């Protein structure tokens, strides 16, 4: 086509989706990770995660308001990945890298799994 | 704005 | 903070939101523009438009499944702007620029209004 | 990935 493109549009959209999440606006699901609860938008979770994409395209699970993750999933690891979904920024640290990588593998977030593998390999 |  | 950032994350999220729109997945509103109907995600419309942001933060309108736009709004102009919201690409042409600019002013999409003004000024 |  002969379209023009606004370079900062995708980033501006993601920034506004994060502002709606912070104010709890039109969030339609709560993700339960052991004792912790995280409110989010189903569309953003699906757009970022192979696991959520599979869950919310399922004809019965698409209508659930609560999703319980596997008890082995660490709440902090999940929180870090949820923040990444909404911002593009990943808070990766020596103290959380193992939990972040395990959570990213479970959530099927291949680019996160890739950087965790590379950061771990460099420390070996 | 750019030509993509 | 000491975060790392994935450059293509926002663009990848927007691409997946557009794929969900194309397959009509988790769309929660229909925008009526005269005889034409457009299905979308309320969160994406709010993230892109000052008008939709105002509408869906309203305690009564946030729950509506149908929104009727002003009869002066051109369906093609709306379609072009909806495509822009979901892709960052604007199909701006001599034959549609007046309708696109009027629709962008109504929807409160200031960056679109700006490029339309500049493209019109250059032709004068 | 980059340092933002
Ligand atoms: O590493 C990742 C990140 C990811 C996201 C999604 N999401 C979607 N993919 C295709 N079309 C649609 Cl409509 C969506 Cl929402 C699926 C798989 C994976 N894997
Ligand atoms: O030209 C534009 C594009 C636009 C989008 C929105 N959206 C939001 N703004 C602030 N916080 C939130 Cl939560 C959202 Cl969703 C509001 C005004 C405008 N004007
Ligand atoms: Cl990823
Ligand atoms: Cl805009």
Short mmCIF file of C-alpha atoms and ligand atoms in Angstrom, two decimals:
data_model
loop_
_atom_site.label_atom_id
_atom_site.label_comp_id
_atom_site.label_asym_id
_atom_site.label_seq_id
_atom_site.Cartn_x
_atom_site.Cartn_y
_atom_site.Cartn_z
CA UNK A 1 0.00 0.00 0.00
CA UNK A 2 0.86 3.77 0.10
CA UNK A 3 0.23 4.16 3.91
CA UNK A 4 2.27 6.47 6.22
CA UNK A 5 3.31 5.06 9.58
CA UNK A 6 3.40 6.81 13.08
CA UNK A 7 6.59 5.40 14.67
CA UNK A 8 5.53 5.91 18.35
CA UNK A 9 1.89 4.61 17.92
CA UNK A 10 2.42 1.02 19.25
CA UNK A 11 4.40 2.30 22.30
CA UNK A 12 1.69 4.98 23.02
CA UNK A 13 -1.05 2.31 22.81
CA UNK A 14 0.84 0.03 25.23
CA UNK A 15 1.47 2.97 27.65
CA UNK A 16 -2.30 3.71 27.70
CA UNK A 17 -3.20 0.01 28.19
CA UNK A 18 -0.84 0.02 31.21
CA UNK A 19 -2.55 3.23 32.56
CA UNK A 20 -5.96 1.45 32.26
CA UNK A 21 -4.47 -1.58 34.12
CA UNK A 22 -3.08 0.67 36.95
CA UNK A 23 -6.55 2.30 37.41
CA UNK A 24 -8.30 -1.09 37.08
CA UNK A 25 -10.29 0.09 34.02
CA UNK A 26 -12.04 -2.60 31.92
CA UNK A 27 -9.83 -5.38 33.39
CA UNK A 28 -11.86 -8.59 32.81
CA UNK A 29 -9.83 -11.30 34.54
CA UNK A 30 -7.99 -12.04 37.77
CA UNK A 31 -4.92 -14.32 37.57
CA UNK A 32 -4.44 -16.25 40.85
CA UNK A 33 -0.85 -17.26 41.65
CA UNK A 34 -0.98 -19.06 45.02
CA UNK A 35 -1.96 -16.42 47.63
CA UNK A 36 -1.59 -13.53 45.11
CA UNK A 37 -4.14 -12.00 42.71
CA UNK A 38 -3.37 -9.97 39.56
CA UNK A 39 -6.00 -8.08 37.55
CA UNK A 40 -5.45 -7.74 33.76
CA UNK A 41 -7.00 -7.48 30.30
CA UNK A 42 -7.52 -10.89 28.62
CA UNK A 43 -6.57 -9.37 25.20
CA UNK A 44 -3.17 -8.12 26.43
CA UNK A 45 -2.39 -11.48 28.15
CA UNK A 46 -3.27 -13.33 24.88
CA UNK A 47 -1.18 -10.88 22.81
CA UNK A 48 1.91 -11.61 25.04
CA UNK A 49 1.63 -15.27 26.05
CA UNK A 50 1.16 -18.54 24.16
CA UNK A 51 -0.44 -20.01 27.31
CA UNK A 52 -3.05 -17.20 27.68
CA UNK A 53 -3.68 -17.23 23.91
CA UNK A 54 -4.59 -20.98 24.19
CA UNK A 55 -6.72 -20.41 27.38
CA UNK A 56 -8.83 -17.48 26.17
CA UNK A 57 -9.50 -18.99 22.68
CA UNK A 58 -11.00 -22.02 24.45
CA UNK A 59 -14.84 -21.86 24.13
CA UNK A 60 -15.38 -22.48 27.93
CA UNK A 61 -12.30 -20.77 29.46
CA UNK A 62 -12.82 -17.56 27.40
CA UNK A 63 -15.79 -16.80 29.76
CA UNK A 64 -14.00 -17.34 33.11
CA UNK A 65 -13.32 -14.26 35.32
CA UNK A 66 -10.71 -16.18 37.42
CA UNK A 67 -7.72 -18.26 36.14
CA UNK A 68 -5.64 -20.25 38.64
CA UNK A 69 -2.03 -20.89 37.65
CA UNK A 70 -0.01 -24.03 38.54
CA UNK A 71 1.07 -23.95 42.28
CA UNK A 72 4.80 -24.14 41.27
CA UNK A 73 4.51 -20.64 39.72
CA UNK A 74 6.19 -17.94 41.77
CA UNK A 75 4.04 -14.76 42.31
CA UNK A 76 7.05 -12.39 41.97
CA UNK A 77 8.11 -14.06 38.69
CA UNK A 78 4.53 -13.63 37.43
CA UNK A 79 4.39 -9.97 38.57
CA UNK A 80 7.68 -9.18 36.71
CA UNK A 81 6.32 -10.84 33.52
CA UNK A 82 2.93 -9.06 33.79
CA UNK A 83 4.81 -5.73 34.11
CA UNK A 84 6.87 -6.70 30.99
CA UNK A 85 3.67 -7.51 28.99
CA UNK A 86 2.34 -3.99 29.66
CA UNK A 87 5.63 -2.02 29.33
CA UNK A 88 8.27 -3.94 27.20
CA UNK A 89 10.61 -3.60 30.27
CA UNK A 90 11.84 -6.71 32.08
CA UNK A 91 13.19 -6.40 35.67
CA UNK A 92 15.72 -9.24 35.35
CA UNK A 93 18.04 -9.71 38.38
CA UNK A 94 20.42 -12.41 39.74
CA UNK A 95 17.90 -13.04 42.57
CA UNK A 96 14.83 -13.50 40.31
CA UNK A 97 16.22 -14.87 36.98
CA UNK A 98 15.44 -18.56 37.74
CA UNK A 99 11.79 -17.77 38.73
CA UNK A 100 11.37 -15.37 35.73
CA UNK A 101 12.70 -17.99 33.24
CA UNK A 102 10.51 -20.80 34.70
CA UNK A 103 7.41 -18.52 34.62
CA UNK A 104 8.22 -17.40 31.01
CA UNK A 105 8.55 -21.07 29.93
CA UNK A 106 5.14 -21.87 31.51
CA UNK A 107 3.52 -18.74 29.99
CA UNK A 108 5.16 -19.50 26.58
CA UNK A 109 6.91 -16.08 26.20
CA UNK A 110 9.76 -17.19 23.93
CA UNK A 111 11.70 -13.87 23.75
CA UNK A 112 11.86 -13.69 27.59
CA UNK A 113 12.97 -17.38 27.77
CA UNK A 114 15.72 -16.52 25.20
CA UNK A 115 17.20 -13.52 27.13
CA UNK A 116 17.08 -15.50 30.46
CA UNK A 117 19.00 -18.40 28.82
CA UNK A 118 21.66 -15.96 27.46
CA UNK A 119 22.00 -14.11 30.82
CA UNK A 120 22.38 -17.48 32.67
CA UNK A 121 24.93 -18.82 30.10
CA UNK A 122 27.12 -15.66 30.58
CA UNK A 123 27.23 -16.23 34.40
CA UNK A 124 28.40 -19.90 33.95
CA UNK B 1 5.43 9.95 10.61
CA UNK B 2 7.50 7.85 8.13
CA UNK B 3 7.23 5.88 4.87
CA UNK B 4 7.21 2.29 6.30
CA UNK C 1 15.40 0.97 37.45
CA UNK C 2 17.86 -1.61 35.95
CA UNK C 3 15.29 -3.14 33.49
CA UNK C 4 16.16 -4.41 29.96
CA UNK C 5 13.77 -3.48 27.16
CA UNK C 6 12.52 -5.65 24.15
CA UNK C 7 12.41 -3.13 21.26
CA UNK C 8 9.76 -4.97 19.14
CA UNK C 9 7.39 -5.83 22.10
CA UNK C 10 4.85 -2.96 21.61
CA UNK C 11 4.63 -3.61 17.82
CA UNK C 12 4.21 -7.42 18.42
CA UNK C 13 1.41 -6.73 20.96
CA UNK C 14 -0.39 -4.42 18.50
CA UNK C 15 0.00 -6.99 15.66
CA UNK C 16 -1.63 -9.67 17.88
CA UNK C 17 -4.46 -7.31 18.95
CA UNK C 18 -5.14 -6.72 15.22
CA UNK C 19 -5.17 -10.55 14.60
CA UNK C 20 -7.76 -10.92 17.43
CA UNK C 21 -9.83 -8.10 15.82
CA UNK C 22 -9.68 -9.80 12.33
CA UNK C 23 -10.92 -13.11 13.86
CA UNK C 24 -13.51 -11.27 16.01
CA UNK C 25 -11.95 -12.61 19.25
CA UNK C 26 -13.00 -10.93 22.54
CA UNK C 27 -14.30 -7.83 20.68
CA UNK C 28 -16.77 -6.23 23.15
CA UNK C 29 -18.30 -3.34 21.21
CA UNK C 30 -19.80 -2.47 17.84
CA UNK C 31 -19.29 1.09 16.53
CA UNK C 32 -22.21 2.14 14.28
CA UNK C 33 -21.37 4.74 11.61
CA UNK C 34 -24.60 5.34 9.66
CA UNK C 35 -25.35 2.08 7.77
CA UNK C 36 -21.94 0.53 8.71
CA UNK C 37 -20.91 -1.54 11.75
CA UNK C 38 -17.35 -2.01 13.08
CA UNK C 39 -16.43 -4.51 15.81
CA UNK C 40 -13.50 -3.60 18.13
CA UNK C 41 -11.96 -3.87 21.59
CA UNK C 42 -13.03 -1.02 23.94
CA UNK C 43 -9.48 -0.93 25.47
CA UNK C 44 -7.78 -0.35 22.10
CA UNK C 45 -10.32 2.37 21.12
CA UNK C 46 -9.69 4.13 24.50
CA UNK C 47 -5.91 3.79 24.09
CA UNK C 48 -6.10 5.55 20.64
CA UNK C 49 -8.91 8.11 20.94
CA UNK C 50 -9.74 10.91 23.37
CA UNK C 51 -13.43 10.49 22.44
CA UNK C 52 -13.51 6.71 23.21
CA UNK C 53 -11.43 7.26 26.36
CA UNK C 54 -14.16 9.71 27.62
CA UNK C 55 -17.03 7.34 26.54
CA UNK C 56 -15.76 4.12 28.10
CA UNK C 57 -14.70 5.76 31.42
CA UNK C 58 -18.31 6.96 31.80
CA UNK C 59 -20.06 4.79 34.47
CA UNK C 60 -23.13 4.12 32.18
CA UNK C 61 -21.54 4.09 28.69
CA UNK C 62 -18.73 1.70 29.79
CA UNK C 63 -21.40 -1.09 29.81
CA UNK C 64 -22.91 -0.45 26.34
CA UNK C 65 -22.27 -3.06 23.58
CA UNK C 66 -23.30 -0.57 20.81
CA UNK C 67 -22.03 3.04 20.29
CA UNK C 68 -23.63 5.20 17.59
CA UNK C 69 -21.42 7.93 16.13
CA UNK C 70 -22.64 11.36 14.91
CA UNK C 71 -24.43 11.02 11.47
CA UNK C 72 -21.91 13.46 9.85
CA UNK C 73 -19.13 10.84 10.35
CA UNK C 74 -18.08 9.13 7.15
CA UNK C 75 -17.82 5.27 7.41
CA UNK C 76 -14.70 5.10 5.17
CA UNK C 77 -12.94 7.78 7.26
CA UNK C 78 -13.79 5.76 10.39
CA UNK C 79 -12.60 2.47 8.80
CA UNK C 80 -9.21 4.08 7.86
CA UNK C 81 -8.79 5.40 11.44
CA UNK C 82 -9.79 2.05 13.02
CA UNK C 83 -7.16 0.34 10.80
CA UNK C 84 -4.60 2.97 11.98
CA UNK C 85 -5.46 2.32 15.68
CA UNK C 86 -4.66 -1.39 15.24
CA UNK C 87 -1.61 -1.09 12.90
CA UNK C 88 0.10 2.39 13.20
CA UNK C 89 -0.44 2.70 9.37
CA UNK C 90 -2.66 5.46 7.98
CA UNK C 91 -4.08 5.11 4.42
CA UNK C 92 -4.09 8.86 3.68
CA UNK C 93 -5.07 9.82 0.09
CA UNK C 94 -6.16 12.98 -1.81
CA UNK C 95 -9.67 11.44 -2.11
CA UNK C 96 -10.10 10.65 1.62
CA UNK C 97 -7.97 13.28 3.48
CA UNK C 98 -10.90 15.64 4.27
CA UNK C 99 -13.05 12.77 5.72
CA UNK C 100 -10.02 11.31 7.62
CA UNK C 101 -9.15 14.71 9.19
CA UNK C 102 -12.80 15.43 10.18
CA UNK C 103 -13.14 11.91 11.71
CA UNK C 104 -9.77 12.29 13.56
CA UNK C 105 -10.91 15.67 14.99
CA UNK C 106 -14.19 14.08 16.21
CA UNK C 107 -12.35 11.02 17.64
CA UNK C 108 -9.70 13.32 19.25
CA UNK C 109 -6.64 11.63 17.61
CA UNK C 110 -4.27 14.61 17.69
CA UNK C 111 -1.30 13.05 15.80
CA UNK C 112 -3.59 12.11 12.85
CA UNK C 113 -5.15 15.63 12.86
CA UNK C 114 -1.55 17.05 12.76
CA UNK C 115 -0.36 15.01 9.71
CA UNK C 116 -3.66 15.77 7.82
CA UNK C 117 -3.18 19.53 8.44
CA UNK C 118 0.46 19.35 7.16
CA UNK C 119 -0.51 17.27 4.06
CA UNK C 120 -3.35 19.75 3.25
CA UNK C 121 -1.07 22.83 3.79
CA UNK C 122 1.52 21.39 1.30
CA UNK C 123 -1.20 21.02 -1.42
CA UNK C 124 -2.30 24.71 -1.00
CA UNK D 1 16.92 -6.48 23.91
CA UNK D 2 18.47 -3.08 24.87
CA UNK D 3 19.33 -0.90 27.88
CA UNK D 4 16.43 1.64 27.68
O1 LIG E 1 6.15 -16.23 22.75
C1 LIG E 1 4.97 -16.12 22.42
C2 LIG E 1 4.11 -14.88 22.52
C3 LIG E 1 2.79 -15.34 21.98
C4 LIG E 1 1.59 -14.68 21.79
C5 LIG E 1 0.52 -15.34 21.17
N1 LIG E 1 -0.50 -14.52 20.67
C6 LIG E 1 -1.15 -14.59 19.48
N2 LIG E 1 -0.54 -15.24 18.47
C7 LIG E 1 -1.18 -15.22 17.30
N3 LIG E 1 -2.36 -14.67 17.01
C8 LIG E 1 -2.95 -14.05 18.01
CL1 LIG E 1 -4.53 -13.45 17.68
C9 LIG E 1 -2.39 -13.93 19.30
CL2 LIG E 1 -3.18 -13.05 20.54
C10 LIG E 1 0.67 -16.68 20.78
C11 LIG E 1 1.87 -17.35 20.97
C12 LIG E 1 2.92 -16.67 21.58
N4 LIG E 1 4.21 -17.11 21.87
O1 LIG E 2 -4.90 12.13 20.65
C1 LIG E 2 -5.26 11.47 21.62
C2 LIG E 2 -5.10 9.98 21.82
C3 LIG E 2 -5.70 9.75 23.17
C4 LIG E 2 -5.86 8.59 23.93
C5 LIG E 2 -6.39 8.69 25.22
N1 LIG E 2 -6.17 7.58 26.06
C6 LIG E 2 -5.78 7.55 27.36
N2 LIG E 2 -5.16 8.64 27.85
C7 LIG E 2 -4.74 8.55 29.11
N3 LIG E 2 -4.88 7.53 29.95
C8 LIG E 2 -5.49 6.47 29.46
CL1 LIG E 2 -5.80 5.20 30.59
C9 LIG E 2 -5.97 6.39 28.14
CL2 LIG E 2 -6.70 4.95 27.54
C10 LIG E 2 -6.80 9.93 25.72
C11 LIG E 2 -6.65 11.08 24.96
C12 LIG E 2 -6.11 10.97 23.68
N4 LIG E 2 -5.85 11.97 22.74
CL1 LIG E 3 8.19 -12.61 25.01
CL1 LIG E 4 -3.28 9.83 16.85
#
